[PDB]
Amino acid sequence: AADYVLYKDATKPVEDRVADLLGRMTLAEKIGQMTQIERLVATPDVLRDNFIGSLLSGGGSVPRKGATAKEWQDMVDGFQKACMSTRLGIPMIYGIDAVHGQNNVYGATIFPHNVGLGATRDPYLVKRIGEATALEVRATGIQYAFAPCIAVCRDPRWGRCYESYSEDRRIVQSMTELIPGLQGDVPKDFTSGMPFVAGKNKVAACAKHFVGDGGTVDGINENNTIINREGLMNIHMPAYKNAMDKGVSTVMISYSSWNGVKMHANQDLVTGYLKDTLKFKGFVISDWEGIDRITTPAGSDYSYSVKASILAGLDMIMVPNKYQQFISILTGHVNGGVIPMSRIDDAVTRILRVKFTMGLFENPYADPAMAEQLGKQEHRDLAREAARKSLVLLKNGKTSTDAPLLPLPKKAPKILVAGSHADNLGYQCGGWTIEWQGDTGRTTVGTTILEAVKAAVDPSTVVVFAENPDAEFVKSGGFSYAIVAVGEHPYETKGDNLNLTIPEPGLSTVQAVCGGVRCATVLISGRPVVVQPLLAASDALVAAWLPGSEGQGVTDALFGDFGFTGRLPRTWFKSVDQLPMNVGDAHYDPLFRLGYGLTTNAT
Ligand SMILES: O=[N+]([O-])c1ccc(O[C@@H]2O[C@@H](CO)[C@H](O)[C@H](S[C@@H]3O[C@H](CO)[C@@H](O)[C@H](O)[C@H]3O)[C@@H]2O)cc1
Numbered sequence: 226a227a228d229y230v231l232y233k234d235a236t237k238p239v240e241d242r243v244a245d246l247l248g249r250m251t252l253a254e255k256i257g258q259m260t261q262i263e264r265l266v267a268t269p270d271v272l273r274d275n276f277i278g279s280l281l282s283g284g285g286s287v288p289r290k291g292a293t294a295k296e297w298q299d300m301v302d303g304f305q306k307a308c309m310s311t312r313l314g315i316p317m318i319y320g321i322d323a324v325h326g327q328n329n330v331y332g333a334t335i336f337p338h339n340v341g342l343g344a345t346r347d348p349y350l351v352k353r354i355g356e357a358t359a360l361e362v363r364a365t366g367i368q369y370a371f372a373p374c375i376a377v378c379r380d381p382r383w384g385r386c387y388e389s390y391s392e393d394r395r396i397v398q399s400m401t402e403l404i405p406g407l408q409g410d411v412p413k414d415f416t417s418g419m420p421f422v423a424g425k426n427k428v429a430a431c432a433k434h435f436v437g438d439g440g441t442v443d444g445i446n447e448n449n450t451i452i453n454r455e456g457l458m459n460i461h462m463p464a465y466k467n468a469m470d471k472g473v474s475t476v477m478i479s480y481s482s483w484n485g486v487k488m489h490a491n492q493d494l495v496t497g498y499l500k501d502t503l504k505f506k507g508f509v510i511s512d513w514e515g516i517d518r519i520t521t522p523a524g525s526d527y528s529y530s531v532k533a534s535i536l537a538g539l540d541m542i543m544v545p546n547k548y549q550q551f552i553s554i555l556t557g558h559v560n561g562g563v564i565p566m567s568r569i570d571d572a573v574t575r576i577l578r579v580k581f582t583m584g585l586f587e588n589p590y591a592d593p594a595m596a597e598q599l600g601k602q603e604h605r606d607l608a609r610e611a612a613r614k615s616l617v618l619l620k621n622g623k624t625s626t627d628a629p630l631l632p633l634p635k636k637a638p639k640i641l642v643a644g645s646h647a648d649n650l651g652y653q654c655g656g657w658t659i660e661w662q663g664d665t666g667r668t669t670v671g672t673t674i675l676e677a678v679k680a681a682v683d684p685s686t687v688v689v690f691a692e693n694p695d696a697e698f699v700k701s702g703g704f705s706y707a708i709v710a711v712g713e714h715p716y717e718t719k720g721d722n723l724n725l726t727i728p729e730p731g732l733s734t735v736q737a738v739c740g741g742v743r744c745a746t747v748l749i750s751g752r753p754v755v756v757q758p759l760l761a762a763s764d765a766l767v768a769a770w771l772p773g774s775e776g777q778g779v780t781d782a783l784f785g786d787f788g789f790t791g792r793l794p795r796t797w798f799k800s801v802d803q804l805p806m807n808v809g810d811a812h813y814d815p816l817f818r819l820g821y822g823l824t825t826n827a828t
């Protein structure tokens with residue numbers, strides 16, 4: 226009728242709908258679009274009264290423990306209903322850290338972390354993982370994933386090194402194939418820097434964290450990256466350009482500084498480079514209290530935090546709790562002329578562009594028929610192939626005369642499975658699983674290394690498990706061989722670690738097991754760790770990284786259903802004193818060099 230409103234018409238071009246809606250919006254409605262809050266502070270009134278643009282779940286932020294896909298859909302729809310009830314009916318976009326599957330969610334397939342995926346050197350495999358991740362995120366009603374982390378981790382003492390595909394940026398550039406797996410492939414004619422999401426079975430992606438998050442002094446998390454423009458652009462920047470080419474919808478800014486300038490206050494890189502040089506037309510989102518941490522101490526001048534972050538070019542602020550202050554402050558800056566309306570309009574233009582482009586206005590609500598995508602066996606089978614492909618065989622016999630231990634026989638009278646990471650799902654998934662920091666034990670649905678062994682061996686093979694057996698026990702047990710798994714515990718800044726040695730017992734358990742019977746040692750870690758002692762005791766040793774929920778990918782290789790193919794995506798140091806040390810360096814003296822990995826052939 227004459228109740229027609231251009232921005233609500235799905236046949237109209239995105240830029241028409243964006244401009245039509247933007248011309249109608251009040252200041253409050255505009256700033257609301259720029260505000261992202263945690264589900265923990267949201268209520269229908271808050272969402273409606275403040276015209277909120279977006280929600281998130283931080284790590285561990287879930288409706289309840291063990292919630293079904295359907296409980297997620299209902300929570301998200303409940304928030305969306307409040308948002309759709311505003312004067313303009315602008316849907317919110319809900320974001321989450323699905324960085325190795327839909328990992329906050331119980332029952333979600335958990336894929337290997339990025340470092341392991343780098344070991345595969347298989348970008349098409351990563352793409353398929355994006356495809357399946359998008360499905361399992363839409364199964365929970367969520368439209369936006371805070372991924373990929375395209376950091377180039379240059380020092381493994383960084384607690385986020387596992388979120389980086391490689392110390393080699395060419396590998397990270399290749400693994401940006403995740404983006405079109407999450408979002409869908411961009412059309413033939415596509416302009417680089419334009420945002421793209423194919424539709425309601427895909428999600429918006431987020432290249433993060435812009436820029437040089439992985440190059441900090443001593444891999445200190447959130448800290449200063451001391452490098453010149455040329456090293457920034459040759460190492461830390463290039464995968465942003467690949468992400469622009471594949472239409473990444475959003476970019477999250479790093480807590481990190483670049484030669485002393487806070488990334489969240491850096492107008493030259495955010496506005497001059499990312500928006501004006503790379504022609505990025507999606508939206509730029511802060512990290513979590515990122516603008517607060519512009520100041521030292523953090524939060525000591527939130528007024529400036531706002532002024533500086535928004536003038537730097539940021540479009541959406543992940544507040545995520547003190548939304549009232551954020552809105553008040555930004556509103557006052559605008560009313561006072563300190564931030565021009567053109568800046569507000571650009572931020573909102575970009576946010577609305579992404580929302581319209583992705584089809585959010587046409588499908589703001591969850592699809593219940595997708596709930597059955599969560600944990601889907603076909604996704605688990607993919608995760609299992611990824612886990613197996615990620616594994617790097619570092620040693621396969623103690624001397625060059627020895628018989629090669631791997632592949633092991635599936636038939637033997639009695640075998641031993643041992644070690645703190647043999648039967649502990651949380652440990653094999655690592656951080657960003659169920660909780661922010663990950664956790665210990667049976668935290669979700671999956672298969673431990675022990676369970677995978679039992680599942681793989683001949684019915685006549687007796688499998689004995691002991692977490693930390695003594696030497697006498699192993700020597701007395703009549704075992705044909707042993708598989709022993711040990712490593713790091715799940716862990717941002719909690720995983721910053723100057724000494725990089727796995728915790729005990731670990732070494733002691735390996736030494737006790739391998740001293741009694743021939744052993745294959747499975748090392749679970751997010752990064753290289755001091756390994757010479759583990760090597761010296763072990764007949765075979767596998768770097769398994771953080772393989773996720775499908776522990777059968779480990780045994781597929783151990784028992785020779787598949788050959789080992791993975792190759793180090795990072796340099797394995799002899800000593801932490803050497804660090805930082807990357808391929809190309811001055812005195813490149815690696816225990817194992819980038820690219821290294823032994824092979825086997827399938828039996
Ligand atoms: O106890 N406190 O007061 C407290 C303080 C800070 C905390 O830190 C916060 O806690 C988690 C929840 O507890 C959050 O998920 C984030 S993550 C940061 O957040 C984004 C969104 O999740 C990710 O995409 C980015 O890649 C990442 O760099 C944050 O670092 C937690 C608790």
Ligand SMILES: *[C@@H]1O[C@H](CO)[C@@H](O)[C@H](O)[C@H]1NC(C)=O
Pocket residue numbers: 445447448449482485
């Ligand atoms: C880096 O960490 C040091 C030591 O904790 C701290 O004093 C400094 O302010 C940090 N720098 C940046 C840029 O975050």
Ligand SMILES: *[C@@H]1O[C@H](CO)[C@@H](O)[C@H](O)[C@H]1NC(C)=O
Pocket residue numbers: 825826
């Ligand atoms: C695996 O196959 C290749 C070539 O066929 C060979 O060079 C390598 O030594 C093989 N290993 C075994 C156990 O046959």
